[PDB]
């Protein structure tokens, strides 16, 4: 049998959890076990690729959508995939909203079975983007989950799935192997037999394995990639197409009064931003991979057509390396060194040191923070790097105990993915929410604009809304955007061919969970 060795995530040890609704799951659950109704190819104009649904139809008023389910699709246990599974899954997320990690509940009023192969979503608001938003919600088997006592703690260790790889062939603390669904509806197009998923804890362990040609499909940071990895074997390849924003997020609800006095001050956030040398961060921490992001709104240069250039220009100076301007702004805001240590105190005279966190083992981000600490010191801002394990880093954001965090964001075909995930205050509440909105800045007007972005399909209307969003975020310097990154992706031709690449650029090539196109990609791979 052919085994494809993949690394969608690092772990200290393999914990058997295939619940697609829990933040604690394994990152081969979505797509590979639970196939979507539709996969949107974001790189190719956000085009739908129909999988378990064969079609959808939005109502004229954009307030409802029906999906026609493909006939003849089976769960891995042999039972039919039907509208009942879609109705059940959305009903579960309404009953247990802690499982609604994307906040779909607010947008979907009801999900009803029309017949065995047709489901109707009634929406709470007109929403031209709802097919995409629905496409991300995992669909589980009603005939299994109806008998689950507590879906919020169920580890789903024996998953029944619709996707290509549902058989748990091997499971050990150091390795699991996920083999092909024997009843897979699209078996005729699937040539890979199993996913081999070794336990790897961090970038340093990853580097040894990747250089030694032990892996097939990864999306890791690899330092000095041309020298360490690409030159090590003629079969070692990579393709890094452009992706989304990375930024320092500041906690507006910090529990320390001196830190809150700094972090909550827009002039301080701007001075912090002007202390940073974004191009040096890119050159040193990312080995040159990335583009400076000097948009106070975080928009980035790839989305310039969505940008109000007057807004970009008005705030760009606060997002440009400018030590002189940073120091002048600190002084003008009243942040002065009143105790002779070379570090500013708050305007009320309090000392403070900002703890800047990034996830342990994400060495590109760790090195970014170290550079930022040195750059902040030059303007008199005292800071220290912290590298908690991801779960602790994430919990500190969900609990509001962090000071500053370096993070990336997901990245869609338009700016809404970044702006909504990064700023909608509705995404700040929920045990299964991700970290991206957890700065605790809130603005009802901003939320209203985000919630209105797709109320029409009119591009001119969406543009005016985008300009309003850009203005609010920029004028509040909510975060400190640093760069636009890349979809890191490395592939090995030793054991498989058919990979996406710059020469074969079929979609986002990442193996990370949250990139639904990885299902389409795996179906193109052919064993050697
Ligand atoms: C429950 C669930 O599915 N969560 C998904 C997230 O796992 C996923 O976030 C991305 O996760 C990967 C793996 O942890 C991150 O990759 C790491 O990135 C750092 C920083 O560049 C790099 O140093 C590491 O090498 C790299 N690790 C690996 C194993 O490749 C990635 O940065 C995360 N991206 C974001 C925006 O958070 C998200 C995103 O795909 O989807 C969730 O569903
Ligand atoms: Mg001082």
Residue numbers in the entry: 1 to 528
Paper text:
Compared with the unliganded structure, the angle of closure between Upper1 and Lower domains of the (GlcNAc)3-liganded structure was found to be 54.7°. Two conformers of the Phe410 side chain were observed near the Site3 GlcNAc, and the individual occupancies of the side chain were also set at 0.5. It is most likely that the mobility of the Site3 GlcNAc is much higher than that of the other GlcNAc residues and that the Phe410 side chain flips alternatively back and forth in the liganded structure. Furthermore, B-factor values of the individual GlcNAc residues were 9.86, 12.67 and 16.28 Å2, respectively, indicating the higher mobility of the Site3 GlcNAc. Here, in (GlcNAc)3-liganded VcCBP we observed the side chain of the corresponding phenylalanine residue (Phe410) at both positions with individual occupancies of 0.5, indicating a significant flipping of the Phe410 side chain. The coordinated motions of the phenylalanyl side chain and the Site3 GlcNAc suggested that Phe410 may be involved in the translocation of bound (GlcNAc)2 from Site1/Site2 to Site3/Site4.
Periplasmic solute-binding proteins (SBPs) specific for chitooligosaccharides, (GlcNAc)n (n = 2, 3, 4, 5 and 6), are involved in the uptake of chitinous nutrients and the negative control of chitin signal transduction in Vibrios. X-ray crystal structures of unliganded or (GlcNAc)3-liganded VcCBP solved at 1.2–1.6 Å revealed three distinct domains, the Upper1, Upper2 and Lower domains for this protein. Based on the crystal structures and molecular dynamics simulation, we here propose that the three domains, Upper1, Upper2, and Lower domains, which correspond to domains I, II, and III, respectively, are required to explain the translocation process of (GlcNAc)2 by CBP.
